[PDB]
C-alpha cells in the first residue's frame, strides 16, 4: 500500500516486532520517535535482534516491506556485550559493524520511508497514538512513549496491570 494507510503500516510492522519482545517478558518499554528528517525510530529494551541462510534473523529485516519501501533503514542492536550497526542503503545492506561495549540489550529500527513510493510521507500523530494506545492496553505494564520532533507533540501510554 502506497498511501497514508500504507505509510503508517511501516510503523505497525516495526512496532509489532518490538511489542512481541514485551509480550514474551523481555522488553519493558517501547520508544517511538517521529523525526524532523522524515524517519521513524522504534526503540525497545528487548533481547536485541540476533547478529540455512534463512536462519539469520537480520534477513527478516532485510527482506521486509519496511526495508523495501525505505530509501534507508538503520538497525542498531545492543546484544552479546556490544552495540551493533546494520545499515541498509535503498534495501542494500552494508557490512555488520561492531561498536562499543555495553551490558544492555535491545533493538533500535530507524527508517526513512521513500518519498517517491509514498505521495505523503507525513505521518499522523493521532493515528500513531491510536495504534500505540492499543499496544500498551494489550500489554499491561508496558510503557510506550511517543514523541514528534516536528511540533513537540509527546504522549506516554501505560495501563497498570
Ligand atoms: C521490519 C522488522 C523490524 C524488526 C524485526 C525484529 C525481529 N526480531 C526481533 N527480535 C528477536 C530477538 C531475539 C531473537 O532470538 C531468537 C532465538 C536465538 N537465535 C536462534 C537462531 N540463531 C541463529 C540466532 C539466535 C529473535 C528475534 C525484533 C525486536 N525488535 O526485538 N525485531 C523484524 C522485522 C521484519
Ligand atoms: Na533487555
Swiss-Prot record:
It is found in: Cytoplasm. It comes from the Bacteria. Few gyrases are as efficient as E.coli at forming negative supercoils. Not all organisms have 2 type II topoisomerases; in organisms with a single type II topoisomerase this enzyme also has to decatenate newly replicated chromosomes. Supercoils relaxed DNA in an ATP-dependent manner. A type II topoisomerase that negatively supercoils closed circular double-stranded (ds) DNA in an ATP-dependent manner to modulate DNA topology and maintain chromosomes in an underwound state, also catalyzes the interconversion of other topological isomers of double-stranded DNA rings, including catenanes. At comparable concentrations has a stronger decatenation activity than E.coli, which is inhibited by ciprofloxacin and novobiocin. Cleaves dsDNA at the sequence 5'-AT/GGCC-3', leaving a 4 base overhang. Negative supercoiling favors strand separation, and DNA replication, transcription, recombination and repair, all of which involve strand separation. Type II topoisomerases break and join 2 DNA strands simultaneously in an ATP-dependent manner. Heterotetramer, composed of two GyrA and two GyrB chains. In the heterotetramer, GyrA contains the active site tyrosine that forms a transient covalent intermediate with DNA, while GyrB binds cofactors and catalyzes ATP hydrolysis. Belongs to the type II topoisomerase GyrB family. This is DNA gyrase subunit B.
Amino acid at each position: 500500500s502506497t498511501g497514508e494507510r500504507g505509510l503508517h503500516h511501516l510503523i505497525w510492522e516495526v512496532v509489532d516486532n518490538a511489542v512481541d519482545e514485551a509480550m514474551a517478558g523481555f522488553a519493558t518499554r517501547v520508544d517511538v520517535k517521529i523525526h524532523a528528517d522524515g524517519s521513524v525510530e522504534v526503540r525497545d529494551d528487548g533481547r536485541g535482534i540476533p547478529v540455512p541462510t534463512i536462519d539469520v534473523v537480520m534477513t527478516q529485516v532485510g527482506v521486509s516491506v519496511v526495508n523495501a519501501l525505505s530509501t534507508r533503514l538503520e538497525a542498531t542492536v545492543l546484544r552479546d556485550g556490544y552495540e551493533w550497526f546494520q545499515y541498509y542503503d535503498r534495501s542494500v545492506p552494508g557490512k555488520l559493524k561492531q561498536g562499543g561495549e555495553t551490558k544492555e540489550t535491545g533493538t533500535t529500527i530507524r527508517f526513512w520511508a521513500d518519498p517517491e513510493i509514498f505521495e505523503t510521507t507525513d505521518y499522523n500523530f493521532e493515528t500513531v497514538a491510536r495504534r500505540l494506545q492499543e499496544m500498551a492496553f494489550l500489554n499491561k505494564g508496558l510503557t510506550i512513549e511517543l514523541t514528534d520532533e516536528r511540533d513537540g507533540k509527546h504522549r506516554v501510554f501505560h495501563y497498570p496491570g
